[PDB]
Amino acid sequence: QTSARNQWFGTITARDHDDVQQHVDVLLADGKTRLKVAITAQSGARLGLDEGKEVLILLKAPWVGITQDEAVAQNADNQLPGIISHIERGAEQCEVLMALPDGQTLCATVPVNEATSLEQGQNVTAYFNADSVIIAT
Amino acid sequence: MQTSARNQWFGTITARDHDDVQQHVDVLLADGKTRLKVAITAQSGARLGLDEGKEVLILLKAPWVGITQDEAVAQNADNQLPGIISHIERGAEQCEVLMALPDGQTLCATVPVNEATSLQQGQNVTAYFNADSVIIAT
Ligand code: MOO
Numbered sequence: 001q002t003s004a005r006n007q008w009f010g011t012i013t014a015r016d017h018d019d020v021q022q023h024v025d026v027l028l029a030d031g032k033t034r035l036k037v038a039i040t041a042q043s044g045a046r047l048g049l050d051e052g053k054e055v056l057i058l059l060k061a062p063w064v065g066i067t068q069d070e071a072v073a074q075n076a077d078n079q080l081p082g083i084i085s086h087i088e089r090g091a092e093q094c095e096v097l098m099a100l101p102d103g104q105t106l107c108a109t110v111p112v113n114e115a116t117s118l119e120q121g122q123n124v125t126a127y128f129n130a131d132s133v134i135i136a137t
Numbered sequence: 138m139q140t141s142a143r144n145q146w147f148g149t150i151t152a153r154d155h156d157d158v159q160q161h162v163d164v165l166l167a168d169g170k171t172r173l174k175v176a177i178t179a180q181s182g183a184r185l186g187l188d189e190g191k192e193v194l195i196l197l198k199a200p201w202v203g204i205t206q207d208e209a210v211a212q213n214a215d216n217q218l219p220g221i222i223s224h225i226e227r228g229a230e231q232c233e234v235l236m237a238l239p240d241g242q243t244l245c246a247t248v249p250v251n252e253a254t255s256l257q258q259g260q261n262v263t264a265y266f267n268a269d270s271v272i273i274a275t
C-alpha cells in the first residue's frame with residue numbers, strides 16, 4: 001500500500017548488466033503494456049530482477065506527463081496512448097484520469113497551466129522516464 | 138519493505154493540508170529531528186490515512202536526489218539533507234554517490250556521469266529533492 005496512484009503488477013522480461021544503473025523491461029499483467037525501468041545495479045541484484053520475476057511497478061502521479069504532442073511522447077522512455085476519462089482542475093494542479101485500452105485507469109497530476117487544452121474524450125499519450133519508476137516485490 | 142528505492146526511511150506524519158487535488162504532508166524521520174515535505178494526491182492522503190501521528194515509510198529513488206554545494210540551490214529545494222560523500226562509483230553514463238547522514242545512515246544518489254566529475258569522496262555537500270519525488274508507503 002503506497003501513495004503511488006499507479007500500481008501495476010508485471011513481470012521482468014529482460015535485464016541489462018551495467019555496473020551503476022541497469023535497465024529492465026517489464027511486461028504488465030494486461031499482457032501487452034511494455035515498460036522500460038532503470039534501477040541501481042545493487043537493486044537489480046538485491047531484488048533478483050531476472051526474466052520471469054513478478055514485480056509491482058510504482059509510478060507516482062506527478063511523474064506522468066499527458067501530451068497531445070507525438071514527438072514529446074516519442075522522446076520519452078515510456079509511452080501509453082489512451083483516452084482522457086476525467087479531469088479535475090485544482091488551483092495549482094490537475095488530476096487527469098486516462099482510460100488505458102484494457103479499461104484500467106492511469107492517474108497523472110499535471111500543473112494546471114499544462115492542462116488547458118486537455119478535455120475528456122481526447123486521445124492523448126501518458127509518458128514518463130525509465131528512472132521515474134520504483135520496482136517493488 | 139523490498140523495493141528498488143535505495144533510500145527508505147521511517148517517519149511520522151506531523152501535518153497535512155487538505156487542498157483539493159494535491160496535498161502536502163510534513164514527515165518527521167526516525168532521528169526525531171529531520172523533517173521532510175511530501176506531496177501526494179488528495180485521494181491517496183485519505184486512502185492511506187495520512188493524518189498527524191500516522192507512521193509510514195518514505196521511498197526516495199536514487200535518481201531523484203540532487204547533490205549540490207550551493208547554498209541557494211539547497212535552500213530553494215523542498216527538502217535538503219547536508220552530509221559528506223562517503224563513496225562514489227563511476228559508470229559510463231551514471232555515477233552512484235553515497236553520502237553519510239547522521240546516525241550511521243547512507244543516502245544514495247544516481248547522478249549523470251557528466252554532472253558528477255567534480256564530486257569526490259570526502260566533500261561536504263547537500264542532498265536535495267522535491268516534495269513530489271517521494272512516495273509514502275504504509
Ligand atoms: O503519491 Mo501520489 O498520490 O501518486 O502523488
Ligand code: MOO
Binds near residue numbers: 039044134247
Ligand atoms: O535502485 Mo533505485 O534507482 O533507487 O530504484
